[PDB]
Amino acid sequence: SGFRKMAFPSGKVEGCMVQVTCGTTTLNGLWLDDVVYCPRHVINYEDLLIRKSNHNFLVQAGNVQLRVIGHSMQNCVLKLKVDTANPKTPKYKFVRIQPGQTFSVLACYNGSPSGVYQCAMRPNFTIKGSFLNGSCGSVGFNIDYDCVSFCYMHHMELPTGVHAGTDLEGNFYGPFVDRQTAQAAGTDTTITVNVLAWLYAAVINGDRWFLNRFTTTLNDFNLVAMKYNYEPLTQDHVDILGPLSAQTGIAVLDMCASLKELLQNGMNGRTILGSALLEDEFTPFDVVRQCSGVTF
């Protein structure tokens, strides 16, 4: 029993964190094999990069200085070739996630990991993270079996306190650019398929007060979702919730009618899994994994 916001064990990622310094800027880098990946804002980026030589980049792994032997740019990420391959390099892939998908963030300062937390890529492509100055280059990841899938690298904080970054190939999530300009996050929406997954997790843990005898259609529900700034629920979302529906005996559109009533009436002083708000940062897979005990 119990339901917590749970991150993947960060050990395989901790062994890759390094400190990168260029001039007065100090941020974090990801050391995989003989390459260190970091935000290019550490340095017209091509014009600024041509003026830098290998010895201008200071890379520190723990108490050891790594020797930079090459440098190249891929989109908004700088790739620093080093002389030493990271002996702690785990099995890994670079993956681009979609809004609604969750991941763990290992927040770092000066190449030293300070905390790990779980979060979701919002529909507006921002992340509601917890980052201070020096956190740039901190990474987001998932673990599947023994393989680390790197999906995010932190680049910047927006005026509202939300965060923006790129995949590990340097492509931003969202209509953001790596520069100090008037940039604002778009209006955000609630991740509907994730709220439904979290309602199934509540039923599994013995919280059934919000269940009712009613069912609905995808059409009727999507009109309600549009009214309360909820993302549209697709037939793919319904299919993905199939296993949880089979386990609890509550059809996905039966649970949609429960969510419709919660949106139109509130919780009436009650909570669901110790929360007075509808939680949308657990995917259907997260709910199944946490309510099964999958290890890494």
Ligand X SMILES: O=C(Cc1cccc(Cl)c1)Nc1cncc2cc(C(=O)O)ccc12
SS3 201: helix
Asked if residue 81 lies in contact with residue 38, where contact means CB atoms within 8 angstroms, the answer is no
Q: Are 280 and 120 in contact (CB under 8 A)?
A: yes
Strand partners, 152: 140
Rule CB under 8 A: say whether 176 interacts with its own copies: no
Q: Catalytic one among 22, 136, 151, 256?
A: 136
Q: Which residues bind Cl ion (CB under 5 A)?
A: 97-98, 101
Residue 167 to residue 174: CA distance in whole angstroms = 11
| Known catalytic membership, residue 136 | yes
185 part of the interface to its own copies, by CB under 8 A: no
Half-sphere exposure of 17 (CA within 13 A, CB side): 25
Q: Between residues 45 and 210, which has the closer beta carbon with respect to ligand X?
A: 45
**Options 17, 77, 119, 156; binder of ligand X; rule CB under 6 A:** 156
Question: Does 107 interact with ligand X (rule: CB under 6 A)?
Answer: no
Rank residues 198 and 230 by Cβ distance to ligand X and give the closer one.
198
Instruction: Tell me the C-alpha distance between 39 and 27, whole Å.
Output: 8
Task: Rank residues 101 and 205 by Cβ distance to Cl ion and give the closer one.
Answer: 101
26 counts as binding ligand X under rule CB under 6 A: no
Is 55 annotated in the active site? no
Task: Give the residue, chosen from 132, 146, 187, 268, that forms a contact with ligand X under the rule CB under 6 A.
Answer: 132
Of 51, 58, 9, residue with least CA distance to 29: 58
Least gap, CB of 74 to ligand X (angstroms): 16
> Applying CB under 6 A, does 180 fall inside the site for ligand X?
yes
How many CB atoms lie under 10 A from the CB of residue 263? 17
CA torsion angle 113 115 119 123 (round to 10): -60
User: By CB under 6 A, is residue 131 in contact with ligand X?
Assistant: yes
Residue 64 in the binding site for its own copies (CB under 8 A): no
- Tokens at 203, concatenated: 């039923």
Can you give the binding site for its own copies, defined by CB under 8 A?
1-12, 14-15, 106-110, 112-117, 119, 128-135, 157, 161-163, 205-206, 271, 274-277, 289-296
Active site residues: 41, 136
